[PDB]
Design a protein around this nucleic acid. Structure first.
Ligand SMILES: [Mn+2]
Ligand SMILES: [Mn+2]
Ligand SMILES: [Mn+2]
Ligand SMILES: [Mn+2]
Ligand SMILES: [Mn+2]
Ligand SMILES: [Mn+2]
Ligand SMILES: [Mn+2]
Ligand SMILES: [Mn+2]
Ligand code: NA
Length: 326
DNA sequence: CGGCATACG
DNA sequence: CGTA
DNA sequence: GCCG
């Protein structure tokens, strides 16, 4: 049978039920915009179950027994199978509320609560926001200023160029420090909206103080448009032929003791990690985050040298990054 | 009924 | 709140 | 919305 947790099954990048999963993900996004985090999670889980199936769902009977499919998710699939369209999904898609909330929450620095307040105030367009600069945080100002570039897919060639400049700054800041590409690109995605790097040093503690030194060296090379510790959510000025474009880059430092946990958490997917943390606590009584895995009865942390160690300690079959696309 | 992942900036 |  |  299909396991109930997304961390118990492989989910490849390319799968066979895109139409159905995308419809469920619209409903999940809309639930989020209305502040229904539980409904969002159900619709996300149901969409993910379809991504893990080996073949297209052709008939409604093939949903029987699948986890996270109840009355509502099943009716969505039913109507898509019967008619090619789901009335509910189309009503959401076309709604002013959905389209504006999607527009605003895709801005760096804006989440659902901020977007909803702006919507209730009657704002509808990016220009509306630019017309009221006093109502913006510095983060939001940077997100709006660079919004067009930040909406342009990041390509592998960009990733490679960014990894070179980050490696150069890291090596200038601390000899022997390493840079690991994480996020969606480590899962095999060919494009993305941002690039994520995890930085460590093989000698425990040597990485203390590292991220401000890296940030100073990147800024002195003119590479930083926006910044500001362990996590830096940056916008880089990435050189292009005769020009440049803004790219979102996340830089994360971890001590080598935490590195496997940070690598696992920052590699994703987001649903995969939520499900893995839920599995850890609810099924094995252990507390997982990007720092470690804690046994609250013995009050001890599990020493891991690899991601494989973490899966093993949780009693899970190991899944490589390209099968974590839940 | 109530949980739903768990951190840092 | 925002970010991941 | 689904489920323990
Ligand atoms: Mn396949
Ligand atoms: Mn319903
Ligand atoms: Mn019908
Ligand atoms: Mn990413
Ligand atoms: Mn820390
Ligand atoms: Mn990122
Ligand atoms: Mn309830
Ligand atoms: Mn409910
Ligand atoms: Na946002």
């Amino acid at each position: 049978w299909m396991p109930a947790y997304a961390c118990q099954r492989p989910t490849p990048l390319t799968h066979h039920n895109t139409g159905l999963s995308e419809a469920l993900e619209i409903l999940a996004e809309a639930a989020g915009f209305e502040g229904s985090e539980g409904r969002l999670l159900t619709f996300c889980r149901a969409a993910s179950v379809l991504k893990a199936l080996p073949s297209p769902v052709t008939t409604l009977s093939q949903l029987q027994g699948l986890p996270h499919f109840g009355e509502h998710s099943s009716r969505v699939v039913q109507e898509l199978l019967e008619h090619g369209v789901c009335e509910e999904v189309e009503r959401v898609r076309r709604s002013e509320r959905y389209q504006t909330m999607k527009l605003f929450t895709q801005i760096f620095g804006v989440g659902v609560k901020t977007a909803d307040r702006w919507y209730r105030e009657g704002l509808r367009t990016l220009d509306d926001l630019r017309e009221q600069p006093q109502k913006l945080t510095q983060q939001q100002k940077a997100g709006l200023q660079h919004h067009q570039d930040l909406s342009t897919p990041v390509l592998r060639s960009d990733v490679d160029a960014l990894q070179q400049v980050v490696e150069e700054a890291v090596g200038q800041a601390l000899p022997g420090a390493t840079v690991t590409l994480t996020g969606g690109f480590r899962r095999g995605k060919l494009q993305g909206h941002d690039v994520d790097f995890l930085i460590t040093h093989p000698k425990e503690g040597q990485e203390a103080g590292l991220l401000p030194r890296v940030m100073c060296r990147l800024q002195d090379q003119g590479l930083i448009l926006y910044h500001q510790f362990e996590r830096s959510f940056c916008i880089f000025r990435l050189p292009q032929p005769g020009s440049w474009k803004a790219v979102r880059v996340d830089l994360v430092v971890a001590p080598v003791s935490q590195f496997p946990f940070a690598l696992l958490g920052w590699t994703g997917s987001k649903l995969f990690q939520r499900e893995l943390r839920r599995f850890s606590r609810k099924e094995k009584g252990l507390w997982l985050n990007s720092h470690g895995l804690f046994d609250p009865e013995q009050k001890t942390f599990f020493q891991a040298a690899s991601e494989e160690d973490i899966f093993r300690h949780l009693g899970l079959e190991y899944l490589p990054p390209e099968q974590r696309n839940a």
